[PDB]
Design a protein around this ligand. Structure first.
Ligand SMILES: Nc1ncnc2c1ncn2[C@@H]1O[C@H](COP(=O)(O)OP(=O)(O)NP(=O)(O)O)[C@@H](O)[C@H]1O
Ligand SMILES: Nc1ncnc2c1ncn2[C@@H]1O[C@H](COP(=O)(O)OP(=O)(O)NP(=O)(O)O)[C@@H](O)[C@H]1O
Ligand code: SF4
Ligand SMILES: [Mg+2]
Ligand SMILES: [Mg+2]
Lengths: 608, 325, 282, 527
C-alpha cells in the first residue's frame, strides 16, 4: 500500500461570487522512497490540493475525493485521529512563512512543543536539547542562542527554515513541502535540499514538494506532475518530462527556464497571456486561449490524460505534433542575442572604496553597547551606460546597503560616487532632484514599498504626477505601463492588499519604469514570480535595454538569471567584493574559493 | 518579572501624587464653599465668616493649604465637611461599599465580554455572532441610568411572577437578617445581583467589541494552522496560541474599562440607593465641599491605577517578550 | 485611460453599505427635523395645558402630555435640539484638539513626545466624568451652552490623541515614504499624499464615536442635576423626570429614552460603516 | 381618587379588635433622612417625622379624638382638672405607675423643668415653640410629688396642648440645663416612658429600630418591632411594591396608581391640619426685604392653577388654601386672600412703579437682576410647585432660581439660619390651631424664619389670646390672618388630602387625620 493514493480530489471555495473550483479532479500517488514534484504556474491550484490532503483548508471549502494515507481514508476523520496522523506521519512545510510562527513563543520552545506532542513522555529538557540540535541540522547560524529568539527578530529566510525544522521534528513518514526555497539563497537552499535528501534516504519518506524553480526538480525529484487550472496536465519521470516535453503547456514551461550556460542576451520563451479565472471556466481545453496549436476540436471538450509513451501521460489531443520540436518552434519565436553588449565608454556609476556602518542597538534604556555591523567595507563598482552589473552573494553580504548608498545621492562616510558623471558632493537636495528622474529603484520587498491605502493607478502614477508630467498623459502612460508587465485596467482600482505576492512585485517594476530612467537599481524583482512570468520580464528588460540603452544594477538570489542579463558580475562576500569580471571569466572560470562553491551549489537544469 | 514591575509602579506612584495635587487645585478654584453661608439674609457676622474660613484652611494660599491637607491626610484624618462632621469617620466604610460593587462588576464583565468576543470571532457570520453583535451594539448604545431603570421596572414583575423575592433593589442589605452567616450572606447575594448586572452588562458590551477584532486579527494570521499541523487539536491550538496572542491588546484597555465602570458606579449607586462613594461624590459636589471631593478623587484614581497595574502584571504573564527577558 | 480617482473610489464603497447609509440618513433627518418641526405642531414648547394633564397620545397632543401639562412632543424636540447640538460641537472641538496634540507629539518624537504623552497619561488617571462634574458648579446657571461645550471637549481628546500619535509615529518610519523621496516627491507633498490621507480618516471615524461619547456625558451630567437646568430641557432631564411614571403612564418615559437610544444606535452604526469604508479589508 | 381635602370627623385606620390580631411582626416604614437632633423641643429637632416616631416612646397628657375631642390619658395621668377660673390653676396628677426608661419616676419637677425650659425667659435654650409656657406664672408641687398645680398669669384658653397633640413630655434630666437641651441628644434619644423604645441607631445602614418597653405599664403592644429606614422620595413607592416597607404617604397621581394597581396594599384617606406654602424672607439683606416687592410678586403666582396641578386625581375639584390660621374644615375658616388675588398686569404696573423695568428677558434695577432663590426638598411632588411657580413668574420677568436640597439638614442648615429667598415646606398642626400665632406670626416668634412682622400683628395676636369665648376669639384670629395676608408674609398653597398607602393586612394604623394612634393596638392580620 502506498503513502498517498489520492483519487479524484476536487476542492471548491465558496466565496460571495460564484464558487471557484481550485481543483477539478486530480488523482495521483506517492511511494515510500520517491520524490514527486508538482510544478505549474500561479493560480494552478497546487497549494489548494496539498492543504486539502492534510485537511487544513478553511471551513468554507468543499472537498470531495478519495485520499487515503495508508488505506485510512483521511476525508471523513474528525480532528481527533486527524491530529494523530498530523505531525507524526505528515510534515507540512507551508509556502509563505512570514506569519507561520506564534509571536509569543521562543522558536526553540516551538520546535520542542512539536516534538513533545507525539512523544509525550520525553522531558522538557531532552525535548529542548533535541530542538536546539535540529536548529543546526537545518543550518541556522548559532543554534544555542538563536533557540532563545522570538519570531519577530528573524531574517525571513531563517523563519523560513524554522518551519522546516518543525515539519521534520518528529521524523514524518511523509513530509509535504510547498515552495520551501523562496526566501533562501543558493548555499542555504543547497544544504536544505541536502537535509531533505537525507530524510528521503535514511528514513525512506515520500516528499510531496511543490516548487517554483525547475532546477530543484531536475536534480531532486523522481517523478513530476504539471498542473494547469485544477487538473494534472502531464505526468512523467523527470528524465521524460525533460527532453520529452510532449505537450504545449509544458513545452512553454520548460522553454522559459534560465540556464547557467546561456550566452549574454538570449531570450527565453514565455507563454503569452494570463491563466483563467477558475470561476467561469468556459468549455474546452483550458489552454485554448493561449495555446499556439489550438484547433476547433480543442474546444469541444476538455481532453483527459491518455498514454503517449511508457509511464507518460498528457492531456492533449494533438500531442503528435510536439515530439522532437523545441519551444522556439512550437511558439514560433526566436531566442538569440542581437545586443550581446551595448558597446560604450560612458561611465554612469562609479563607486570608490565605499564604507558604511550602522551603530548597533540591542538594549533599551542603559545598554552597554558593544560592537557594530560593518555592512560595507571598501567596494568599488562601475557601469557603462548600456550594460548591467550583477551583484550576487549570500544573505548579509551588503548588496542592498550598497544599492541604497548610491540612491541617496549624498556624500558617503567614505568614498566617491559619480552618478551620471559628477561626484555627488556639489549637488544637495534641489540639485539632486533634477538627477532623480533618471535613476530609480525596484525595492526587494514589494509589500512594504507600496502604500497599502492607494489604488494601483495612484501607486504607479506617483513617479509621474510628482515629476514633469500632466494629466492626460498620466492616464495614458499608466495604461501601457500596466499592460507591459501584464496587469489590467481594472486592477488599477484594486488596492495592494488584494494582490498576490508575485502580482504586487510587478507593480513595483511598473512603477519604477514610469519615467523611463537611464539607470535602474533592481533588488531581486523576480524573487516571487513563477518561471513563465519571470521569463516575460527578463525578455522585457533585455530588449528595453536594447532599443533605449538602459543601465541596470541587478542583484538576485539566483545566478542563472544573472547570466541572462549581466555583462559584468561582482561576487561580493561579507561586505567586500571578492571578484569582478566579464561574467564569462566569472561564471565560466571561478578563481576564488567562494565563487567556485557559489557556482557549485547552483542546480543543474537537466537531469542526470 | 521583579524588575519590570518596579519601574512600572514607581511611576504609578508619581502619577497618583501629581493627580491628587492637580485635582486639589481644580476643586479649590471651582468650588465656593462659603457662598451658601455668606448669602444668608441676616448676613452672618465677620466672626463666623473668619471662623468657618479658618476651620477649612481657606485663609491660606492654595499651595500652603494643599501641603497642610496632605500633611495629615497621610496621618489618618481628612478634615471636616462643610458642616464640621469628620470625613474619615465615613470614608472607611464607604470605600468597602463601592469596592464590592466594582470588583464584582469588573470581574464578571471583563470575563463575559472576552468570552463572548472570542466566540463570536470564531463564528464570524453565523446566526450566533449576529445576535451577540447586535446585542452588544444596543447595550453599548444606551446610557447606564436607562439600563438601571429598565432593569428595576422589569425585574419587579419577575418577583411578582415567582413570589419568593428572588432579588430586590433597595439598599445593600435588609433588616432582620439575624440567622447564621449563611442567611446574612444569602441576603447580600440577593441584594447584589441587579446593580452588578447593570455594571457587568456595560463592561461586557464594551470589551467584546475589542475582543472580536483582536481574535479576528490572529485568525487572519496563519500560525494557528501551523500549530495544528504538528498534532495540536483545533481547540487546544486556539486556546494555547490564538487566544494567548489575542489577549495582548485587551490588557491595554482593561484600565480604561475600569475607569468607565467607576463612572457608571455613580449612577448605579444613586439609582439603587447604595451608600458608597458615588453617592458621596454627588453629595459633595452639590454642596460644594472640597474635602469630600478631594478624598473621593484620590480613591478613584487609585482604583484606576491599581487596575492598570494588574493589567500590566497579566500582560507580562501572557507575553514573555515584554519583560526584560 | 479611464482610470478612476481615489476620493471617488471610497465614497462608492461607503454607498454600498446600506446599514451605515441608512444610519447617516436617520441622523441627518433627526437633526434637521429638530429645527423644522416645532413651528408646525399645534402646541408650542414651554407652554402648559392645565386641563390636559397626563393625557395619552391622541388628537390634540399626539405624543401625550406630562405631569405638568406639557406636550411631550415639543418638549422632546427641544431636548433633542440641545442634546444633539452639544454632542456635535463637542465632537468637532475634541477631535481638533486630539489631532493638534497627537500630530505634534508623533512628529517631534524624542523627549518632546515622551513628555507630551506622559501628560496625557496623567490626565487619564482620574475618570473624566468626575473631573467634569467637579467644574459644573461654575457654568451651571449660565445661559449660553458655550462653557459646557468647552468643558466637555477639554476632557475628551486624550484617548484619541493616543492613537493619532501612535500611528503618526509608526507611519513616519516607513518604507513607501522613503521610496516617495527616491522618486522626487517634495517633503510637503509626501505629507499631503501619504500622511494626511491616513490621519484625516482615522479622525473622521473617531468623530463619529466622539458624538456618542459627548452625548452620553451630557445626558449623564444633566441627569444628576448638573449640566442643563430646569427652565430649559435636555434629553437627560426629560428621562430623569419621566423615570417616576413609566409604570403607570409609560408615554412620558418610553419616548425620550427611545429617541436617545435610537440616536446612539445610529451614531454607532455610522461609526462602524465609516470604519469599514475607509479601511475596507481592515 | 375622588374625595374632598377638608378636615373631617372620622379616621381610616382599619380598626380591628386588638386581641384578634397577631402577637408580633415588623413594622417597616420609611423616613426622610436620619434626624440630626432627637430633642423635639429644640429648634433643629422640631420636625414632623421625628416627633411622629417619638410619639410612641414619650408621655402625653391627652388623647385626641377623631373630631378634636380631649380625654385625659388615664395611662399616663389620672386627673387633670381646671380648678381656678380667673387665674387658671390646672392640676396635673401623675400616675404612680409611670417610670422612665432609666427607672427614675415621673413627678412634678419633670413638668416644672419643661415649662421653664420652653418658658422663653432664658435665651440659652434654642427652643422651637413657647406654647403657653410664657403665660404661666409658676409651677408649684401639688399635695404629692405626683401632683403639680400650674398657675396661669395671662389667660390661656388653649392649655390642653402643652403635653398633647404635637407636644409631649420629656424627662427633667434633658430639660434641666441648656447643655442637655441643646447638645444632649445629637446621637440618640434619652429616657422614654412609652410602650416602645429605640434600641438600634444603626447609622451605617441608615436604620432606626424600635422595640417594646420592658417596663411598659399599660396594655402590652401587639406589635414587637418598628424599624424606620431612611429613604429618599425617589425610591419609596418601589420599596412598597417590592415588600420592603409597609406604609407611606401618597403625594402625586403616580404614587396613587402604583399603590392600588398592586395587590396586598390598601389606600386609606383621612385629611388633617397640614399644608404646604411658600415662605418669604423679609429679613434685612433679602432682595425681598421690600414689602411692596413681596406684595407685587405675590400677585404674579397663580395659586389656583398650582393647586389644580398639584392635587390632580387626588381630590375632586382641587382648590387652594386661603387662610393661615385655619384650614378647610375647622370652624371659622374663610377666604382672606383678596389682597393678593392673581393679577399679573397689576404686578407689572406696580413693579414698574417700583423700579424694576423690563430690559431683556428679566427685569433689572440699578444693575442687579430680579432673581429669587427657591429652596425646597428634592422630591417628586415638591418640585412641581416650583416649576409651576417659576413658569408663571417668568410671565412678568421674574427669575426664580430653583435649589433642590437633600433631606439631611434641610431645616437646620438652610431654613432656621436664613439661607433662602423663598422656602418650600409644610406645617403640621393639631386640634389646637391658635398655638401657631406666637410661634410663627409674631415678630419675635421662634419659628418666624423670615423675620417678617409688625407691631400691629403682635397687638392683634395678644388681643386674640386674651379672649376666652371661642366665638370672638375665632373672629379675632381671622382679623389677624387678614393682617398677615396684607403683609407679604407667606402664601399657603394647598391643604393635605391625607391619603396614605398601607398594606391591607395591617390594622389599627392608617390615616388618622385629627386623631392619634393607639400604639398598644397596632397589630397584623391573623391569617
Ligand atoms: N482560501 C481561498 N479562498 C478562495 N479561493 C481560493 C482560496 N485558496 C485558493 N483559492 C483559489 O484557488 C485557485 C488556486 O489557488 P492556489 O492554490 O494558491 O494556486 P497555486 O497554483 O497553488 N499558487 P502558487 O503557489 O502561487 O503557484 C485560485 O483560483 C484561487 O483564487
Ligand atoms: N538598520 C540596520 N541596522 C543594523 N544592521 C543593519 C541594518 N541594515 C542592514 N544592516 C546590516 O547590514 C548588513 C548587510 O545587510 P543587507 O544589505 O540587507 O544584506 P544583503 O546581503 O544585501 N541582503 P539580501 O539581498 O536580502 O541577501 C548585515 O550585517 C545587516 O545586519
Ligand atoms: S488540447 Fe488543443 S488547445 Fe489544449 S493544449 Fe492541446 S493543442 Fe492546445
Ligand atoms: Mg500556493
Ligand atoms: Mg537586501
Amino acid at each position: 500500500s502506498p503513502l498517498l493514493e489520492v483519487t479524484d480530489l476536487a476542492v471548491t471555495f465558496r466565496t460571495d461570487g460564484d464558487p471557484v473550483t481550485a481543483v477539478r479532479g486530480i488523482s495521483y500517488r506517492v511511494e515510500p522512497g520517491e520524490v514527486v514534484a508538482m510544478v505549474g504556474e500561479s493560480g494552478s491550484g497546487k497549494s489548494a490540493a496539498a492543504m486539502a490532503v492534510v485537511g487544513l483548508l478553511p471551513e468554507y471549502a468543499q472537498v470531495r475525493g478519495s485520499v487515503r494515507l495508508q488505506g485510512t481514508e483521511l476525508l471523513g476523520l474528525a480532528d481527533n485521529a486527524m491530529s494523530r496522523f498530523r505531525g507524526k506521519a505528515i510534515g507540512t512545510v507551508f509556502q509563505d512563512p512570514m506569519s507561520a510562527l506564534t509571536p509569543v513563543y521562543t522558536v526553540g520552545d516551538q520546535i520542542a512543543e512539536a516534538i513533545e506532542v507525539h512523544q509525550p513522555r520525553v522531558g522538557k529538557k531532552a525535548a529542548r536539547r533535541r530542538a536546539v540540535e535540529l536548529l543546526d541540522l537545518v543550518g541556522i547560524s548559532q543554534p544555542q542562542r538563536r533557540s532563545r529568539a522570538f519570531p519577530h527578530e528573524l531574517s525571513g529566510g531563517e523563519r523560513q527554515r524554522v518551519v522546516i525544522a518543525i515539519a521534520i521534528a518528529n521524523d514524518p513518514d511523509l513530509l509535504i513541502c510547498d515552495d520551501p526555497t523562496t526566501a533562501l539563497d543558493v548555499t542555504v537552499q543547497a544544504q536544505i535540499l541536502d537535509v531533505l535528501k537525507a530524510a528521503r534516504d535514511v528514513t525512506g519518506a515520500g516528499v510531496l514538494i511543490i516548487t517554483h524553480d525547475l532546477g530543484v526538480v531536475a536534480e531532486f525529484a523522481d517523478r513530476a506532475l504539471v498542473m494547469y487550472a485544477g487538473r494534472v496536465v502531464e505526468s512523467a519521470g523527470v528524465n521524460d518530462l525533460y527532453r520529452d516535453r510532449r505537450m504545449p503547456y509544458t513545452v512553454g514551461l520548460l522553454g522559459s527556464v534560465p540556464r547557467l550556460d546561456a550566452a549574454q542576451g538570449t531570450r527565453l520563451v514565455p507563454i503569452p497571456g494570463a491563466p483563467p479565472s477558475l470561476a467561469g471556466l468556459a468549455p474546452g481545453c483550458p489552454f485554448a486561449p493561449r495555446c499556439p496549436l489550438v484547433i476547433d476540436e480543442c474546444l469541444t471538450a476538455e481532453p483527459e490524460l491518455l498514454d503517449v509513451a511508457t509511464d507518460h501521460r498528457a492531456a492533449c489531443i494533438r500531442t503528435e505534433l510536439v515530439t522532437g520540436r523545441s519551444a522556439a518552434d512550437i511558439y514560433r519565436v526566436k531566442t538569440e542575442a542581437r545586443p550581446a553588449a551595448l558597446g560604450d565608454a560612458s561611465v554612469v556609476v562609479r563607486v570608490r572604496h565605499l564604507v558604511k556602518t550602522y551603530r548597533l542597538a540591542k538594549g533599551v534604556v542603559l545598554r552597554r553597547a558593544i560592537g557594530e555591523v560593518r555592512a560595507v567595507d571598501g567596494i568599488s563598482l562601475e557601469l557603462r551606460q548600456g550594460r548591467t552589473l550583477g551583484i550576487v552573494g549570500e544573505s548579509g553580504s551588503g548588496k542592498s546597503t550598497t544599492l541604497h548608498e548610491i540612491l541617496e545621492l549624498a556624500a558617503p562616510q567614505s568614498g566617491s560616487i559619480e552618478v551620471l558623471g559628477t561626484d555627488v558632493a556639489t549637488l544637495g537636495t534641489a540639485e539632486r532632484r533634477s538627477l532623480r528622474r533618471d535613476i530609480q529603484v525596484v525595492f526587494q520587498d514589494p509589500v512594504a514599498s507600496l502604500d497599502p491605502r492607494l489604488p494601483v493607478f495612484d501607486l504607479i502614477a506617483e513617479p509621474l504626477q510628482a515629476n514633469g508630467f500632466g494629466k492626460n498623459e498620466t492616464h495614458a502612460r499608466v495604461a501601457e505601463l500596466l499592460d507591459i508587465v501584464g496587469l489590467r485596467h481594472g486592477d488599477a482600482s484594486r488596492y495592494p492588499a488584494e494582490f498576490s505576492g508575485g502580482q504586487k512585485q510587478r507593480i513595483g517594476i511598473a512603477r519604477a519604469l514610469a519615467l523611463q530612467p537611464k539607470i535602474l537599481a533592481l533588488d531581486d524583482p523576480v524573487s516571487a514570480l513563477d518561471v513563465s512570468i519571470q521569463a516575460g520580464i527578463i525578455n522585457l528588460l533585455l530588449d528595453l535595454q536594447e532599443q533605449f540603452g538602459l543601465s541596470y544594477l541587478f542583484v538576485s538570489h539566483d545566478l542563472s538569471v544573472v547570466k541572462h542579463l549581466a555583462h559584468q558580475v561582482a561576487v561580493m562576500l561579507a561586505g567586500t567584493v571578492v571578484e569582478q569580471g566579464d561574467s564569462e571569466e566569472v561564471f565560466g572560470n571561478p578563481k576564488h574559493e567562494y565563487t567556485r562553491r557559489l557556482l557549485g551549489a547552483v542546480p543543474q537544469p537537466d537531469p542526470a | 518579572m521583579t524588575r519590570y514591575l518596579a519601574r512600572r509602579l514607581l511611576n504609578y506612584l508619581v502619577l497618583l501624587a501629581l493627580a491628587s495635587f492637580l485635582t486639589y487645585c481644580l476643586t479649590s478654584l471651582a468650588f465656593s464653599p462659603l457662598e451658601s453661608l455668606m448669602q444668608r439674609s441676616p448676613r452672618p457676622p465677620q466672626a463666623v465668616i473668619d471662623a468657618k474660613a479658618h476651620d477649612l484652611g481657606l485663609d491660606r494660599p492654595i499651595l500652603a493649604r494643599y501641603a497642610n491637607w496632605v500633611s495629615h491626610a497621610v496621618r489618618g484624618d481628612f478634615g471636616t465637611t462643610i458642616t464640621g462632621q469628620p470625613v474619615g469617620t465615613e470614608l472607611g466604610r464607604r470605600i468597602g461599599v463601592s469596592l464590592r460593587l466594582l470588583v464584582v462588576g469588573s470581574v464578571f464583565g471583563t470575563v463575559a465580554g472576552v468570552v463572548i468576543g472570542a466566540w463570536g470571532a470564531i463564528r464570524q457570520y453565523r446566526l450566533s455572532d449576529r445576535v451577540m453583535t447586535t446585542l452588544a451594539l444596543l447595550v453599548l448604545s444606551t446610557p447606564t441610568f436607562v439600563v438601571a431603570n429598565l432593569l428595576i421596572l422589569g425585574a419587579l414583575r419577575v418577583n411578582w411572577a415567582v413570589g419568593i423575592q428572588l432579588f430586590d433593589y433597595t439598599g445593600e442589605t435588609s433588616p432582620g437578617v439575624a440567622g447564621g452567616v449563611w442567611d446574612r450572606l444569602g441576603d447580600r447575594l440577593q441584594h447584589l445581583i441587579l446593580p452588578s448586572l447593570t455594571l457587568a452588562l456595560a463592561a461586557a458590551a464594551g470589551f467584546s467589541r475589542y475582543q472580536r477584532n483582536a481574535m479576528l486579527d490572529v485568525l487572519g494570521q496563519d500560525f494557528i494552522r501551523t500549530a495544528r499541523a504538528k498534532g495540536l487539536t483545533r481547540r487546544r491550538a486556539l486556546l494555547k496560541h490564538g487566544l494567548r496572542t489575542a489577549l495582548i491588546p485587551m490588557a491595554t484597555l482593561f484600565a480604561y474599562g475600569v475607569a468607565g465602570l467607576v463612572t457608571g458606579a455613580v449612577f448605579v449607586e444613586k439609582i439603587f440607593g447604595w451608600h458608597g462613594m458615588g453617592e458621596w461624590m454627588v453629595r459633595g459636589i452639590s454642596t460644594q465641599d472640597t474635602n469630600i471631593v478631594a478624598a473621593i478623587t484620590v480613591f478613584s484614581g487609585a482604583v484606576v491605577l491599581l487596575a492598570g497595574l494588574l493589567s500590566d502584571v497579566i500582560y507580562a504573564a501572557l507575553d514573555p517578550r515584554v519583560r526584560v527577558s | 485611460t479611464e482610470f478612476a480617482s481615489r476620493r471617488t473610489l471610497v465614497v462608492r464603497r461607503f454607498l454600498r453599505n446600506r446599514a451605515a447609509v441608512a444610519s447617516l440618513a436617520a441622523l441627518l433627518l433627526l437633526f434637521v427635523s429638530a429645527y423644522a418641526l416645532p413651528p408646525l405642531l399645534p402646541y408650542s414648547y414651554d407652554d402648559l395645558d392645565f386641563n390636559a394633564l397626563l393625557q395619552p397620545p391622541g388628537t390634540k397632543h399626539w405624543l401625550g402630555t406630562n405631569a405638568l401639562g406639557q406636550d411631550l412632543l415639543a418638549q422632546t424636540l427641544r431636548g433633542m435640539q440641545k442634546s444633539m447640538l452639544i454632542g456635535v460641537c463637542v465632537a468637532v472641538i475634541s477631535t481638533g484638539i486630539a489631532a493638534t496634540v497627537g500630530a505634534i507629539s508623533g512628529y517631534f518624537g524624542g523627549w518632546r513626545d515622551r513628555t507630551l504623552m506622559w501628560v496625557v497619561d496623567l490626565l487619564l488617571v482620574v475618570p473624566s466624568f468626575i473631573l467634569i462634574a467637579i467644574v459644573t458648579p461654575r457654568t451651571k446657571n449660565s445661559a449660553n451652552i458655550m462653557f459646557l461645550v468647552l468643558l466637555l471637549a477639554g476632557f475628551g481628546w486624550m484617548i484619541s490623541s493616543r492613537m493619532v500619535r501612535g500611528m503618526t509615529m509608526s507611519l513616519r518610519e516607513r518604507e513607501f515614504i522613503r521610496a516617495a523621496r527616491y522618486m522626487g516627491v517634495s517633503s510637503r507633498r509626501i505629507i499631503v499624499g501619504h500622511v494626511v490621507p491616513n490621519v484625516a480618516s482615522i479622525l473622521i471615524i473617531d468623530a463619529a464615536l466622539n458624538v456618542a461619547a459627548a452625548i452620553l456625558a451630557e445626558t449623564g451630567l444633566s441627569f444628576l442635576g448638573f449640566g442643563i437646568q430646569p427652565p430649559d430641557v435636555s434629553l437627560g432631564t426629560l428621562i430623569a423626570d419621566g423615570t417616576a411614571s413609566a409604570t403607570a403612564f409609560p408615554w412620558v418615559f418610553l419616548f425620550p429614552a427611545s429617541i436617545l437610544v435610537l440616536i446612539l444606535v445610529c451614531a454607532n452604526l455610522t461609526g462602524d460603516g465609516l470604519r469599514d469604508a475607509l479601511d475596507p479589508a481592515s | 381618587a375622588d374625595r374632598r381635602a377638608a378636615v373631617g370627623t372620622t379616621s381610616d385606620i382599619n380598626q380591628q379588635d386588638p386581641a384578634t390580631l397577631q402577637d408580633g411582626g415588623n413594622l417597616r416604614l420609611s423616613l426622610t433622612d436620619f434626624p440630626p437632633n432627637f430633642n423635639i423641643l429644640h429648634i433643629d429637632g422640631n420636625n414632623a417625622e421625628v416627633a411622629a416616631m417619638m410619639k410612641a416612646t414619650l408621655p402625653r397628657a391627652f388623647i385626641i379624638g377623631p373630631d378634636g375631642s380631649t380625654t385625659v390619658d388615664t395611662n399616663y395621668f389620672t386627673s387633670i382638672e381646671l380648678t381656678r377660673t380667673a387665674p387658671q390653676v390646672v392640676t396635673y396628677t401623675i400616675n404612680p405607675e409611670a417610670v422612665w426608661s432609666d427607672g427614675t419616676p415621673i413627678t412634678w419637677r419633670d413638668i416644672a423643668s419643661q415649662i421653664h425650659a420652653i418658658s422663653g425667659a432664658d435665651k440659652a435654650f434654642e427652643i422651637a415653640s413657647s406654647s403657653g409656657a410664657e403665660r404661666v406664672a409658676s409651677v408649684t408641687r401639688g399635695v404629692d410629688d405626683r401632683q403639680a398645680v400650674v398657675t396661669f398669669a395671662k389667660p390661656y384658653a388653649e392649655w390642653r396642648g402643652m403635653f398633647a397633640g404635637n407636644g409631649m413630655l420629656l424627662p427633667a434630666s434633658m430639660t434641666a440645663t441648656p447643655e442637655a437641651f441643646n447638645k444632649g441628644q445629637l446621637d440618640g434619644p434619652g429616657p422614654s416612658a412609652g410602650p416602645f423604645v429605640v434600641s438600634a441607631l444603626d447609622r451605617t445602614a441608615q436604620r432606626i429600630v424600635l422595640t417594646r418597653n420592658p417596663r411598659w405599664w399599660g396594655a402590652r403592644p401587639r406589635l414587637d418591632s418598628i424599624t424606620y429606614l431612611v429613604l429618599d422620595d425617589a425610591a419609596r413607592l418601589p420599596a412598597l411594591q417590592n415588600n420592603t416597607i409597609d406604609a407611606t404617604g401618597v403625594g402625586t397621581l403616580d404614587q396613587l396608581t402604583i399603590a392600588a394597581r398592586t395587590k396586598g396594599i390598601s389606600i386609606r384617606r383621612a385629611p388633617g391640619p397640614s399644608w404646604y406654602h411658600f415662605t418669604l424672607n423679609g429679613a434685612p439683606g433679602s432682595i425681598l426685604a421690600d414689602k411692596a416687592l413681596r406684595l407685587a410678586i405675590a400677585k404674579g403666582i397663580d395659586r389656583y392653577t398650582i393647586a389644580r396641578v398639584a392635587q390632580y386625581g387626588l381630590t375632586s375639584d382641587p382648590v387652594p388654601l386661603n387662610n393661615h390660621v385655619f384650614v378647610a374644615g375647622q370652624d371659622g375658616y374663610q377666604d382672606n386672600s383678596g389682597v393678593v388675588a392673581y393679577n399679573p398686569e397689576q404686578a407689572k404696573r406696580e413693579l414698574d412703579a417700583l423700579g424694576w423695568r423690563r430690559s431683556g428677558a428679566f427685569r433689572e434695577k440699578d444693575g442687579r437682576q430680579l432673581v429669587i432663590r427657591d429652596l425646597f426638598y428634592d422630591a417628586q411632588s415638591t418640585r412641581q410647585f416650583a416649576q409651576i411657580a417659576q413658569h408663571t413668574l417668568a410671565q412678568i420677568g421674574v427669575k426664580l432660581e430653583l435649589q433642590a436640597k437633600s433631606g439631611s439638614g434641610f431645616f437646620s442648615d438652610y431654613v432656621n439660619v436664613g439661607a433662602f429667598d423663598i422656602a418650600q415646606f409644610g406645617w403640621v398642626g393639631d386640634a389646637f390651631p391658635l398655638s401657631s400665632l406666637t410661634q410663627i406670626y409674631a415678630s419675635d416668634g421662634e419659628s418666624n424664619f423670615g423675620k417678617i412682622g409688625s407691631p400691629q400683628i403682635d397687638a392683634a395676636i395678644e388681643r386674640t389670646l386674651a379672649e376666652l369665648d371661642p366665638g370672638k376669639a375665632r373672629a379675632l384670629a381671622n382679623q389677624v390672618d387678614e393682617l398677615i395676608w396684607a403683609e407679604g408674609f407667606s402664601l399657603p398653597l394647598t391643604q393635605s388630602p391625607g391619603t396614605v398607602a398601607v398594606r391591607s393586612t395591617l390594622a389599627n394604623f392608617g390615616a388618622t387625620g385629627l386623631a392619634d394612634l393607639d400604639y398598644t393596638a397596632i397589630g397584623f392580620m391573623r391569617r
